[PDB]
Amino acid sequence: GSASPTPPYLKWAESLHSLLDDQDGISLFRTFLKQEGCADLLDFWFACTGFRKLEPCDSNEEKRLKLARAIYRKYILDNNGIVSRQTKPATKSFIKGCIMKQLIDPAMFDQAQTEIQATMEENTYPSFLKSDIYLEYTRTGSESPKV
Amino acid sequence: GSASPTPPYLKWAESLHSLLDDQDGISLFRTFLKQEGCADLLDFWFACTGFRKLEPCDSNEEKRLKLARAIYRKYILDNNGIVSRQTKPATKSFIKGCIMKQLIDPAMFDQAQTEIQATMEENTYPSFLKSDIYLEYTRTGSESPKV
């Protein structure tokens, strides 16, 4: 039989994974977050995904250290920021230890990433799925162009 | 005298043209864009560059029409996408007209490409140049391998 693709907006409602696998979804969700001062949740989540992909070798040591320090300073250390409020003290302390000791394993941010993924799942993601930009603008179909 | 090449990362900061002329730069910039749901800006820009290179002959008519329709459907018609939001109504209408009338000049996407190039120049490109992946990871030098 002929396939029947799930409309993108509906796929995003099915899982945060599906939403974050679609450029249109990421853009719309990110803008929604920015308007609530929560975009750092998503930006940090992606920063961790990118960092974990880098593997250690004797020529990219300082590069990886500087990047890890940057992620830490931008999101973990910013006490006026949402990521600092949504990651546990022990989790942040572990990262601080890695940075200060210069022990930078590719998976060092895993726990914090998990915690931030959980916060999105519990609050902002479901909130986005109730937003007017999602339920009213995005969900509504486009007309077929004419003339 | 002996030449002193500009470090690649610095060349990318000098112009978007330089960034898009370097495989390393394109990859890093594209990943940065993907994380913000903005990769379509770059992918569309390249699609236009490739389309404009094809010239009309009586044996590649349908091929060119199908490609033009594909670019239009993927980026111009997707109202939940960033390219649709960053190209003017008149610009999109012209392209739609070309597609529906089957009048496919190699330069038909020029205006939309110009508009998207402008959006990158004004926002995402400068944003990329302030990103941790660029300022901290990329800019940092590699150590000389040993043993």
From Swiss-Prot, chains A, B:
Residues 15-138 form the RGS domain. Phosphorylation and dephosphorylation of AXIN1 regulates assembly and function of the beta-catenin complex. Phosphorylated by CK1 and GSK3B. Dephosphorylated by PPP1CA and PPP2CA. Phosphorylation by CK1 enhances binding of GSK3B to AXIN1. The modification Phosphoserine is found at S2, S4, S144. Ubiquitously expressed. It is found in: Cytoplasm; Nucleus; Membrane; Cell membrane. It comes from the Eukaryota. Component of the beta-catenin destruction complex required for regulating CTNNB1 levels through phosphorylation and ubiquitination, and modulating Wnt-signaling. Controls dorsoventral patterning via two opposing effects; down-regulates CTNNB1 to inhibit the Wnt signaling pathway and ventralize embryos, but also dorsalizes embryos by activating a Wnt-independent JNK signaling pathway. In Wnt signaling, probably facilitates the phosphorylation of CTNNB1 and APC by GSK3B. Likely to function as a tumor suppressor. It is linked to Hepatocellular carcinoma: A primary malignant neoplasm of epithelial liver cells. The major risk factors for HCC are chronic hepatitis B virus (HBV) infection, chronic hepatitis C virus (HCV) infection, prolonged dietary aflatoxin exposure, alcoholic cirrhosis, and cirrhosis due to other causes. Caudal duplication anomaly: A condition characterized by the occurrence of duplications of different organs in the caudal region. The tankyrase-binding motif (also named TBD) is required for interaction with tankyrase TNKS and TNKS2. Homodimer. Interacts with ZBED3; the interaction is direct, enhanced by protein kinase GSK3B and casein kinase CSNK1E activities and decreases GSK3B-induced beta-catenin serine and threonine phosphorylations. Component of the beta-catenin destruction complex, containing at least, CTNNB1, an axin and GSK3B, that regulates CTNNB1 protein levels through phosphorylation and ubiquitination. Interacts with CTNNB1 (via the armadillo repeats 2-7). Interacts with GSK3B; the interaction hyperphosphorylates CTNNB1 leading to its ubiquitination and destruction. Component of the AXIN1-HIPK2-TP53 complex. This is Axin-1. The gene is AXIN1.
